[PDB]
């Protein structure tokens, strides 16, 4: 070469701002049966990092992911309406849900993204599973198609851009020709602002909650009554368990899972609710005696 | 011309029920607006036309939009009532001109006025200094309010003209029956060179 | 990706020290080749298994890692030598700074006139602790 | 309202994040400014569940109060844009980024009311500082007064809080694994509630004290109503039935201990039996530690 | 690295991939050339500091200032030389993906073992503005 040759190598990452993610989850779970889709608005820094700052849905038809209610006039109209708010943003990608199963791209899925590849060259297709994502990590990947033609022509070991890694499996269905023929795995990050963090952190307005109140003292004796009688019932069975365990080997006390009502587990289960209650039950009365003295 | 942001200021007042112009000054006001909007959507192919009122607490009935058809359809339902104000109206007009698609449009207010103005000239020529800062053009159409009024608006439109005679001009409409003065005194051919 | 940090960690731990008090060096060396012949170990592991051998034999069994001088002093080229090699936090070609903590510790007899002597050293011990690889 | 058609306004976290994102959209040199959006939501009882919101171009003079602009046409376009994406999303109110109320607000409340009666304000903060929730909800009602002054559009406070869905829950969950709050167990959690509660009463009372001190001197015309209510406060304080109350409160405590005693005792016995189990497992592990 | 130890003849060995005698073709082998030259002449830079300063001063490709910063920082390593510290400082005030990574590292190398308390309050402040996983 007398001049540089085409290049691609890149550890592509997506920042999804704490705002966006919540909208993708919510709106995406709206359509468990018929998955929704949405445009992704934000900026595009250097060339290693997509910055999705915000998203907004698109309408649909009533069968699935049609692109006859993915009107060019919808996204046109909206883009102008968000310029007049104060968002000089452009389309960077398109996300949808594949609820209930693995974060992969289907034939129509692939094909669709191909259109966002002609219209624009920088497109990440981001995937959210509002069902499985529940509680914990939040299953959410990202994918970008890869030129299958160039792969056939000898650039098959030349679709390796320099990404980091962490391995997947259940989507090896279409990821064995996905990761290794049709698309690949981008990696996801977040940006935990301190203002958003001090905002969400709020979940209780207590200046009228506990400590300025306390349950009804006839509602509270009817509670103790019940528990401290259940104590008796469990107690008896507890003696009957302490005679048994002595005369048996731990394999038979191991598989003892018929009527869990007998053992310690329920005297602990109780005492920690009872106590709790009551202690504090306890302090609440005293504290108010001085506070509103 | 260049693409511009036009703001039609129409007035509500008991004075807008005078037979001294075309049947009733109400109806006649409507026709005049209908021509000045249409005539500034053919000068440029694109041009945003507004429509606020100048009475009570000055209000917006339509924001900047290119459809003359909305400007004519809200305008049907006004009513002659209240006492106009010039201050409140102007100042809401800026806030309406800032918000627009595209920042290459020019700021032009087409203002129709029609009842004695009760603000002193000292405050009006402070607002005209703030408009001089904000590069706002303003045409004032005296559809009435020239014999029942000594024009403070003269010192208003000369506070905007340091040297430019198009920067701001106060257009008059003779108070007779004058059918033919509300059509030629239009701001697209009274106080500028263009007439398209 | 923990394996990538425990193969290279071993091959740094052991560069031309052989069977002196750590006989494990034939056990780990085997293991550096165990996972090059395999097509069942991840690329992000293989990359750390190639260097496991590549630094071991570094310099022809002559250079070693030692951040301070045997005189006694922490010389800076070595500190940076293993500080910007270990670092792949985001950049992959940072794998040459390991030539600046490489030192060929050898007695370099220099004659009174800054020229080359001929003179040798008695063995106070057998050639097994002397060592140096065996090409096979 | 007197109507039982409003009471618990419940705002989901993504709204909070949405207004806090809107406050930095405008945020160039137009910051230090009230910014306003419309609240989309659903509701069917004493609730106004807020879910979605989107900024509306809004301006406001910084010394006048009749010079405010709000692109209601923009609303009648977007409102339909979002309806076309989710049915069941009427306009249940509109939010105003604080820091507190402005005289101008009532005006706005009637240019938003041309859509939905019952519209509410939801003052959200752009600065974490309060220890209660940054979400106060007001309604535009009107009333008559005993003094004989003309009817007015005031603003009346209704209780507020934030809730969630599974989606919302999970996203927030995910965003607070840095600031862990789950290491803290039950018992201590509620002691926290009872100290953090005094942290509220303290500053509320403090605010009333600054107000009373404000009218007494450094004059600020008296509003008989405030002082009225402020009398009911000092009649309601628990006092006049002192001796009897004492003799009873002591008794109910006595009970409370009786049951704590029992609780801690059982707890002890059970833990001790646990210890016996450890010792015996240790002996039988010592027979294995020998052998070969 | 393989030819660390060649001094007056290293410019010639690397003259068949270094710029001028070699085409602008693949700026990768030009940037890599400069980086290599900083590896050969690491801590002893004499005429080579000037050579690399003329290679960075007239540079117009991003890859050349990448590998180039990596060579130049090594040749002037442990030194002060306020000229090269400010050239490499301009690389960082230019905000370009792969030029600012290598340039940042190279400026930490130019002032190695010293750092003026002014250069710190320079670099940390510039780290508050910037945005990147490589330059930052």
From Swiss-Prot, chain A:
Q: Gene name, please?
A: PSMD14
Under the GO molecular function aspect, what terms does this record hold?
A: endopeptidase activator activity; K63-linked deubiquitinase activity; metal ion binding; metal-dependent deubiquitinase activity; metallopeptidase activity; proteasome binding
Tissue distribution: Widely expressed. Highest levels in heart and skeletal muscle.
Cite the EC number. Answer: 3.4.19.-
Per UniProt, Zn(2+) binds at: 96, 98, 109
Point out residues bearing the modification Phosphoserine: 133, 207
Provide the assembly information. Component of the 19S proteasome regulatory particle complex. The 26S proteasome consists of a 20S core particle (CP) and two 19S regulatory subunits (RP). The regulatory particle is made of a lid composed of 9 subunits including PSMD4, a base containing 6 ATPases and few additional components. Within the complex, PSMD4 interacts with subunit PSMD7 through their respective MPN domain. Interacts with TXNL1.
PANTHER family linked to this entry: EUKARYOTIC TRANSLATION INITIATION FACTOR 3 -RELATED (PTHR10410)
Record's protein name: 26S proteasome non-ATPase regulatory subunit 14
Q: What is the lineage of its organism?
A: Eukaryota, Metazoa, Chordata, Craniata, Vertebrata
S-S pairs: none
Residues annotated as carrying Phosphothreonine in the record are 249
Could you list this entry's UniProt keywords, alphabetically sorted: DNA damage, DNA repair, Hydrolase, Metal-binding, Metalloprotease, Phosphoprotein, Protease, Proteasome, Ubl conjugation pathway, Zinc
Place the motif JAMM motif on the sequence. 96-109
Question: Ranges for the MPN domain?
Answer: 14-149
Top enzyme category: hydrolase
Q: Name one GO biological process term.
A: ubiquitin-dependent protein catabolic process
Alphabetical list of InterPro entries matching this protein: JAMM/MPN+_dom, JAMM_MPN+_peptidase_M67A, MPN, RPN11_C
Q: Name one Pfam family in it.
A: JAB
Q: Could you say which protein family the record assigns here? A: Belongs to the peptidase M67A family. PSMD14 subfamily.
> Which organism is the protein's source?
Homo sapiens (Human)
Question: What superkingdom heads the lineage?
Answer: Eukaryota
Concerning Gene3D superfamilies, the annotation shows:
Cytidine Deaminase, domain 2
UniProtKB/Swiss-Prot annotation, chain B:
Protein's GO biological process: proteasome-mediated ubiquitin-dependent protein catabolic process
Q: Glycyl lysine isopeptide (Lys-Gly) (interchain with G-Cter in SUMO2): where is this cross-link?
A: 122
Query: Has UniProt tagged this entry with the keyword Zinc?
Result: no
- Cite the entry's keywords alphabetically: Isopeptide bond, Phosphoprotein, Proteasome, Repeat, Ubl conjugation
Gene Ontology cellular component terms for the protein in this record: cytosol; nucleoplasm; nucleus; proteasome accessory complex; proteasome complex; proteasome regulatory particle, base subcomplex
Q: GO MF terms on file?
A: identical protein binding; molecular adaptor activity; polyubiquitin modification-dependent protein binding; RNA binding
User: VWFA domain: which residues?
Assistant: 5-188
Assembly and binders: Component of the 19S proteasome regulatory particle complex. The 26S proteasome consists of a 20S core particle (CP) and two 19S regulatory subunits (RP). The regulatory particle is made of a lid composed of 9 subunits, a base containing 6 ATPases and few additional components including PSMD4. Interacts with NUB1. Interacts with SQSTM1. Interacts with UBQLN4. Interacts with UBE3A. Interacts with UBQLN1 (via ubiquitin-like domain). Interacts with DDI2.
Any domain commentary?
A: The 2 UIM motifs are involved in the binding to a multi-ubiquitin chain in a cooperative way.
Q: Which protein family is named in the record? A: Belongs to the proteasome subunit S5A family.
What name is this protein filed under?
26S proteasome non-ATPase regulatory subunit 4
Gene of origin? PSMD4
Swiss-Prot record, chain D:
Pfam families in UniProt: JAB, MitMem_reg
UniProt-listed GO biological process terms: proteasome-mediated ubiquitin-dependent protein catabolic process
MPN domain span: 9-144
Q: By its UniProt entry, which InterPro entries does this protein fall under? A: EIF3F/CSN6-like_C, JAMM/MPN+_dom, MPN, MPN_RPN7_8
Q: Which UniProt keywords apply?
A: Acetylation, Isopeptide bond, Proteasome, Ubl conjugation
What family does this chain come from, according to its entry? Belongs to the peptidase M67A family.
GO cellular component terms, alphabetically, are: cytosol; extracellular exosome; extracellular region; ficolin-1-rich granule lumen; membrane; nucleoplasm; nucleus; proteasome complex
PANTHER family the UniProt entry points to: 26S PROTEASOME NON-ATPASE REGULATORY SUBUNIT 7 (PTHR10540:SF7), EUKARYOTIC TRANSLATION INITIATION FACTOR 3 SUBUNIT F-RELATED (PTHR10540)
Q: What is this protein called?
A: 26S proteasome non-ATPase regulatory subunit 7
UniProtKB/Swiss-Prot annotation, chain E:
Q: Which superkingdom is the protein from?
A: Eukaryota
Q: Where are the PC repeats?
A: 1-27, 32-65, 67-101, 102-136
Family, according to the entry, reads as follows: Belongs to the proteasome subunit S1 family.
Could you tell me what this protein does?
Component of the 26S proteasome, a multiprotein complex involved in the ATP-dependent degradation of ubiquitinated proteins. This complex plays a key role in the maintenance of protein homeostasis by removing misfolded or damaged proteins, which could impair cellular functions, and by removing proteins whose functions are no longer required. Therefore, the proteasome participates in numerous cellular processes, including cell cycle progression, apoptosis, or DNA damage repair.
Instruction: Summarize subunit and interaction data from the UniProt record for this chain.
Output: Component of the 19S proteasome regulatory particle complex. The 26S proteasome consists of a 20S core particle (CP) and two 19S regulatory subunits (RP). The regulatory particle is made of a lid composed of 9 subunits, a base containing 6 ATPases and few additional components including PSMD1. Interacts with ADRM1. Interacts with ZFAND1.
Q: What is this protein called?
A: 26S proteasome non-ATPase regulatory subunit 1
State the taxonomy lineage: Eukaryota, Metazoa, Chordata, Craniata, Vertebrata
């Amino acid at each position: 070469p007398p001049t540089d040759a085409p290049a691609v190598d890149t550890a592509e990452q997506v920042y999804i701002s704490s705002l966006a993610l919540l909208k993708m989850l919510k709106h995406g779970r709206a359509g468990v049966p018929m998955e929704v889709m949405g445009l992704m608005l934000g900026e595009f820094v250097d060339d290693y990092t997509v910055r999705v700052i915000d998203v907004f849905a698109m309408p649909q038809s009533g069968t699935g992911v049609s692109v006859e209610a993915v009107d060019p006039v919808f996204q046109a109209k909206m883009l102008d309406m968000l310029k007049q708010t104060g968002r000089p943003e452009m389309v960077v990608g398109w996300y949808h849900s594949h609820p209930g199963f693995g974060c992969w791209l289907s034939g129509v899925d692939i094909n669709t993204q191909q259109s966002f590849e002609a219209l624009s060259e920088r497109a990440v297709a981001v995937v959210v599973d509002p069902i499985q994502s529940v509680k914990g990590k939040v299953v959410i990947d990202a994918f970008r198609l890869i030129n299958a033609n160039m792969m056939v022509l000898g650039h098959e070991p030349r679709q390796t851009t320099s990404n980091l890694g962490h391995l997947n499996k259940p989507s090896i269905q279409a990821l064995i020709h996905g990761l290794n023929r049709h698309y690949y795995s981008i990696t996801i990050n977040y940006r935990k602002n301190e203002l958003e963090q001090k905002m969400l952190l709020n979940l209780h307005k207590k200046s009228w909650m506990e400590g300025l109140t306390l349950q009804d003292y006839s509602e509270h004796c009817k509670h103790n009554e019940s528990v401290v009688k259940e104590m008796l019932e469990l107690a008896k069975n507890y003696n009957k368990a302490v005679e048994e365990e002595d005369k048996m080997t731990p394999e038979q006390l191991a598989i003892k899972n018929v009527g869990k009502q007998d053992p310690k587990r329920h005297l602990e289960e109780h005492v920690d609710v009872l106590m709790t209650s009551n202690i504090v039950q306890c302090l609440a009365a005293m504290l108010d005696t001085v506070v509103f003295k | 011309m260049v693409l511009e942001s036009t703001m039609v200021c129409v007035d509500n007042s008991e004075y807008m029920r005078n037979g001294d112009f075309l049947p009733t000054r109400l109806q006649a006001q409507q026709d005049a607006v209908n021509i000045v909007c249409h005539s500034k959507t053919r000068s440029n192919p694109e041009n945003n036309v507004g429509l606020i009122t100048l009475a009570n607490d000055c209000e917006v009935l339509t924001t900047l939009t290119p459809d003359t058809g909305r400007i004519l359809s809200k305008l049907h339902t006004v009513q002659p009532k209240g006492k106009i104000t010039f201050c409140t109206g102007i100042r809401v007009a800026h806030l309406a001109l800032k918000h627009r698609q595209g920042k290459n449009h020019k700021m032009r207010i087409i203002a129709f006025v029609g009842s004695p103005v009760e603000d002193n000239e000292k405050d009006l020529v402070k607002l005209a200094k703030r408009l001089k800062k904000e590069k706002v053009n303003v045409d004032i159409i005296n559809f009435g309010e020239e014999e029942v009024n000594t024009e403070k608006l003269t010192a208003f439109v000369n506070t905007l003209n340091g040297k430019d005679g198009t920067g701001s001009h106060l257009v008059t409409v003779p108070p007779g029956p004058s059918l033919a003065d509300a059509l030629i005194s239009s701001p697209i051919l009274a106080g500028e060179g263009g007439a398209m | 990706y923990v394996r990538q940090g425990a193969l290279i960690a071993s091959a740094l731990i052991m560069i031309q020290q052989t069977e002196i008090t750590c006989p494990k060096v034939n056990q780990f060396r085997q293991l550096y080749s165990k996972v090059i012949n395999d097509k069942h170990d991840d690329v992000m592991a293989k990359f750390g298994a190639i260097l496991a051998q590549g630094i071991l034999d570094a310099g022809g069994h002559n250079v070693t890692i030692s951040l301070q001088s045997r005189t006694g002093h922490t010389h800076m080229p070595s500190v940076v030598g293993v500080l910007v090699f270990t670092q792949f936090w985001f950049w992959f070609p940072l794998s040459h700074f390991l030539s600046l903590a490489y030192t060929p510790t050898c007695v370099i007899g220099l004659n009174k006139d800054l020229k080359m002597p001929k003179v040798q050293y008695k063995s106070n011990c057998k050639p097994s602790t002397f060592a140096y690889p065996a090409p096979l | 309202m007197p109507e039982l058609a409003v009471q618990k306004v419940v705002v989901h976290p993504l709204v909070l994040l949405s207004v806090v994102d809107h406050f930095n959209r405008i945020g160039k040199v137009g910051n230090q400014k009230r910014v306003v959006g419309v609240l989309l939501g659903s509701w069917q009882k004493k609730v106004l569940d807020v879910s979605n919101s989107f900024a509306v171009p809004f301006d406001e003079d910084d010394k006048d109060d009749s010079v405010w602009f709000l692109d209601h046409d923009y609303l009648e376009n977007m409102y339909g844009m979002f309806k076309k994406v989710n049915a069941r999303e009427r306009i249940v109110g509109w939010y105003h980024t604080g820091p507190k109320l402005h005289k101008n607000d009532i005006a706005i409340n009637e240019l938003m009311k041309r859509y939905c009666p019952n519209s509410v304000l939801v003052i959200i903060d752009v600065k974490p500082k309060d220890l209660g929730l940054p979400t106060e909800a007001y309604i535009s009602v009107e009333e008559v007064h005993d003094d004989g002054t003309p009817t007015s559009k005031t603003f009346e406070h209704v209780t507020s809080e934030i809730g969630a869905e599974e989606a919302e829950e999970v996203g927030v969950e995910h965003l607070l694994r840095d600031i862990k709050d789950t290491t803290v167990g039950t018992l201590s959690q509620r002691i926290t509630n009872q100290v953090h509660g005094l942290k509220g009463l303290n500053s509320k009372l403090l605010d009333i004290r600054s107000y009373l001190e404000k009218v007494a001197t450094g004059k600020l015309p008296i509003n008989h109503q405030i002082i009225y209510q402020l009398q009911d406060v000092f009649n309601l304080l628990p006092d006049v039935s002192l001796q009897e109350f004492v003799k009873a409160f002591y008794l109910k405590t006595n009970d409370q201990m009786v049951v704590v005693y029992l609780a801690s005792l059982i707890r002890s016995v059970v833990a001790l039996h646990n210890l016996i189990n450890n010792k015996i497992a240790n002996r039988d592990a010592e027979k294995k530690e020998g052998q070969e | 690295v393989i030819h660390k130890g060649h001094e007056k003849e290293a410019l010639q060995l690397m003259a068949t991939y270094l710029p001028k005698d070699t085409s602008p073709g693949s700026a990768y082998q030009e940037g890599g050339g400069l980086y290599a030259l900083g590896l050969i002449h690491a801590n002893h830079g004499g005429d080579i500091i000037d050579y690399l300063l003329n290679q960075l001063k007239n540079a117009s490709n991003d890859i050349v200032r990448h590998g180039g910063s990596l060579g130049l920082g090594l040749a002037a390593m442990g030194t002060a030389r306020q000229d090269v510290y400010d050239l490499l400082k301009t690389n960082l005030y230019q905000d370009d993906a792969v030029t600012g990574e290598a340039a940042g590292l190279a400026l930490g190398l130019v002032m190695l073992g010293s750092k003026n308390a002014q250069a710190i309050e320079d670099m940390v402040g510039y780290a508050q503005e910037t945005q990147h996983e490589k330059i930052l």
